[PDB]
Design a binder for this molecule. Structure first.
Ligand SMILES: *C(=O)[C@@H]1CCNc2c(NC(=O)CCC(=O)O)cc3cc(O)c(O)cc3[n+]21
Ligand SMILES: [Fe+3]
Lengths: 8, 752
């Protein structure tokens, strides 16, 4: 759970 | 005073014990340094100092006189050994021990093994390390499995890396081997010297040091998919007196791959100096640098698993989801200074400073989501991640011998400190550009590059890490040795998110080793590690989870032959974890607390398995590195995790040097096998969980080399001889990644 926003 | 002596030839240790009686002196010696050696005959009325030197003739053993007692010592680099087995390891406790003396799982890949099989970066090395499974995330990012856990602990001459978040990869996973002597993987729970870290294993990298005689080589290479390589190594004394020594190495590599519109070029530099202040004091200063610059980088796999409406996608191994302009840049550089002093009582202290930079510059663009569409169209998710980590480390330790009951023991006492700072920018608030592409089938990565706009999220994280440690090895019998040790840590992290603070954390080290023969020895150990949870891992009450902690219970037997030219080991392990961050669908189905939407649960997990490996000389000129590993890891409900890591695995790599008139030829090879693995994935369009399985598969490589001139040599490596089509990743964001097709790499080395 690395704080990145992919599609989300 | 002159004493009268009479001591005939016998096993060295008996003659030392009898020397004390015949000289009225106390004798302190390590039985393991002495079991191999044998005492020469002495007869006459002699001075004690003169008599002891005559006794120890032809052994090269030091004698240090202090008080009314005397101490005896009978004392690493893998470069130019011809061996696939290590000499001595100081990774576990700092105490310089043999594999058989160490009560832990530990695996070493040697300079010779690296040279022989042309392993140029850390990835290649792991893909050849017995108990390790290499899976992919995307083109410029991989994962190393060990005993059911991902490896987050990367050390460089003992100094741990603080750039730990793989969401922002910055070099750890693609370090070039040109500057290192060897790479050791210490398995289990390695808290004692690592401090704060994760479970599974620890990767420690040892840097090359300057020689005292001139030595240098140039190696040029070429491989499949326009893959070029160049390296140069130069070493030796720089003054006439030889009080200074240096070493400089430069390497450059540019290549493509079986995947479309993708290339990578790496540039590395390294320089190290040694200074002799007095006969017992040495200063070392050094600097290094590497730069990974790709183009056509992929993100979240290589291609999506399902199309617009589910079904199943079928694409060639050459397909790459990444845009032309997509790049995951990762650059590393270090500046360090070491200083060791030898003290009068056989004691030696060391001080090492470290300054390290881990940075990234990743403008990314790839097709992700359930694509293609029924009209052969798709969409691209484009984001940008840039950042940099500056990390300053101080570590000092002292190590030497001490007596208790007429026995010689050795101790280690140290302290460390670390100050690091991670700053980062993230862009996903794009100034509206077109996501879509016309063609999915014939995608060559052709799409425009967007205006990134203003930063979406800022990261600004400061981390202090303190440590204080002590370890003892008790010499309670010739056959028996007991380790008692431990380490206390203070982990603190300040920044934008709330402060994480752990004071007075404790990590124990307990170990024993018993000797059965001059060959086999049994051992048991108890080890531990913890890692404070990241900000977003919170429970239903918006409270942070307690640090992820685990223990390693190990028992097994080790072997040694040809005084250390061969080692065998068979071990049984068991890892108990607590505070494992998992889902909690109970809350996630119907949230209650307005301060959090996605919450976590801290649960327990348990790996239970065993391991068997062998390395070194099998016959005069016949070297081996091989292992078998079996593992099963479960939840606390009772379900399997890390199912993508196979339960059974077998690795074997060998080489033979020819005899007679053809002692200029060398032939080698490798064979890698793993058992079935699987991932449980969710099909979104069709609203179901589906199972994806990879069958058991073999991986064979072959090798041949000739010593042409006397200085000039040539080699060939062929990886994946049988062109096995197989996968290296499934469940990672509903994506997939193929494994490397047939491989070739040719080489030429000069040696000045
Ligand atoms: C956080 O870890 C998220 C979600 C779960 N998995 C995962 C990983 N890695 C791991 O969980 C460690 C074990 C494994 O090999 O899966 C990779 C990570 C990569 C990136 O960048 C995103 O976006 C989050 C991914 N996460
Ligand atoms: Fe990510």
């Amino acid at each position: 759970x690395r704080x990145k926003k992919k599609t989300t | 005073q002159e004493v009268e002596f009479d001591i005939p030839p016998q096993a060295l240790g008996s003659a030392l014990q009898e020397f004390g009686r015949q000289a009225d002196i106390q004798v302190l010696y390590r039985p393991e340094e002495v079991r191999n050696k044998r005492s020469s005959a002495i007869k006459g009325k002699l001075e004690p100092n003169q008599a002891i030197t005559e006794l120890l003739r032809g052994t090269g053993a030091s004698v240090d006189f202090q008080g009314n007692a005397i101490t005896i010592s009978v004392a690493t680099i893998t470069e130019d050994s011809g061996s696939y087995t290590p000499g001595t390891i100081a990774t576990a406790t700092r105490l310089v021990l043999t594999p058989r003396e160490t009560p832990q799982s530990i695996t070493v890949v040697t300079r010779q093994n690296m040279d022989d099989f042309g392993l140029n970066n850390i990835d290649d090395v792991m893909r050849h390390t017995p108990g390790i499974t290499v899976s992919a995330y995307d083109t410029d990012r991989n994962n190393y499995y060990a005993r059911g856990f991902s490896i987050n602990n990367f050390q460089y001459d003992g100094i741990p890396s603080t750039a730990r978040n793989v969401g922002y990869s910055a070099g750890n996973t693609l370090s070039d081997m040109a500057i290192y002597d060897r790479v050791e993987v210490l398995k289990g729970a390695t808290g004692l010297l690592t401090g704060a870290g994760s479970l599974g294993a620890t990767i420690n990298l040892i840097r090359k040091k300057p020689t005292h005689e001139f030595k240098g080589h140039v190696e040029l290479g070429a491989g499949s998919w326009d893959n070029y390589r160049s390296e140069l190594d130069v070493s030796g004394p720089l003054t006439e007196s030889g009080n200074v020594r240096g070493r400089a190495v430069a390497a450059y590599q540019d290549k493509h791959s079986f995947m479309d519109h993708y290339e990578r070029k790496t540039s590395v530099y390294y320089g190290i100096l040694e200074f002799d202040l007095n006969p017992d004091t040495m200063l070392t200063v050094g600097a290094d640098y590497q730069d990974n610059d790709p183009k056509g980088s992929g993100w979240s796999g290589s291609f999506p698993l399902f199309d617009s409406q589910g079904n199943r996608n079928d694409v060639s191994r050459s397909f790459n989801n990444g845009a032309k302009w997509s790049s995951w840049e990762q650059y590393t550089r270090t500046v360090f200074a070491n200083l060791e002093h030898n003290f009068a009582n056989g004691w030696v202290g060391k001080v090492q400073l470290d300054h390290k930079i881990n940075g990234y510059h990743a403008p990314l663009g790839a097709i992700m989501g359930d694509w293609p569409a029924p009209d052969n169209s798709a969409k691209i998710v484009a984001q940008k991640y840039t950042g940099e980590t500056k990390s300053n480390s101080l570590d000092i330790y002292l190590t030497g011998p001490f007596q208790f009951l007429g026995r010689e023991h050795e101790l280690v006492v140290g302290t460390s400190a670390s100050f690091s700072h991670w700053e980062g920018k993230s862009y996903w608030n794009l100034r509206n550009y077109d996501n879509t592409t016309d063609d999915f089938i014939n995608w060559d990565g052709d799409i425009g590059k967007p205006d990134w706009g203003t930063p979406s999220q800022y990261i600004d994280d400061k981390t202090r890490q303190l440590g204080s440690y002590m370890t003892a090895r008790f010499n309670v019998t010739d056959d028996l040795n007991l380790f008692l040790g431990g380490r206390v840590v203070d982990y603190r992290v300040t920044g934008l998110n709330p402060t994480i603070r752990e004071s007075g954390r404790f990590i124990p080290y307990v170990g024993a080793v018993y000797d059965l023969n001059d060959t086999y020895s049994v051992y048991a150990s108890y080890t531990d590690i913890f890692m404070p949870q990241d900000s977003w891992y919170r429970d239903s009450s918006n409270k942070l989870l307690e640090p992820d902690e685990g223990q390693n219970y190990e028992i097994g037997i080790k072997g040694e032959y040809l005084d250390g030219r061969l080692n065998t080991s068979l071990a049984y392990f068991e890892i108990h974890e607590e505070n494992r961050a998992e889902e909690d669908a109970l809350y996630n189905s119907k949230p209650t607390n307005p301060a959090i939407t996605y919450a976590y649960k801290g649960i327990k997990a348990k790996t239970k398995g065993y391991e068997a490996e062998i390395s070194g000389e099998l016959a005069p000129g016949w070297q081996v590195q091989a292992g078998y590993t079996h593992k099963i890891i479960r939840d606390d409900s009772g379900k399997k995790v890390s199912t993508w890591e196979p339960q059974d695995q077998l690795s074997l790599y060998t080489s033979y040097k020819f005899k007679g008139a053809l002692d200029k030829l060398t032939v080698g090879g490798g064979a890698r096998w793993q058992g079935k693995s699987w991932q449980m994935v969710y099909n979104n369009p069709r609203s179901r969980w589906e199972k994806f399985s990879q069958e058991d598969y073999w991986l064979v490589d072959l090798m041949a080399r000739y010593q042409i001139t006397d200085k000039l040599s040539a080699s060939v490596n062929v990886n994946n001889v049988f062109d096995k089509t197989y996968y290296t990743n499934i469940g990672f964001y509903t994506s997939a990644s193929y494994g490397d097709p047939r491989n070739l790499m040719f080489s030429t080395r000069w040696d000045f």
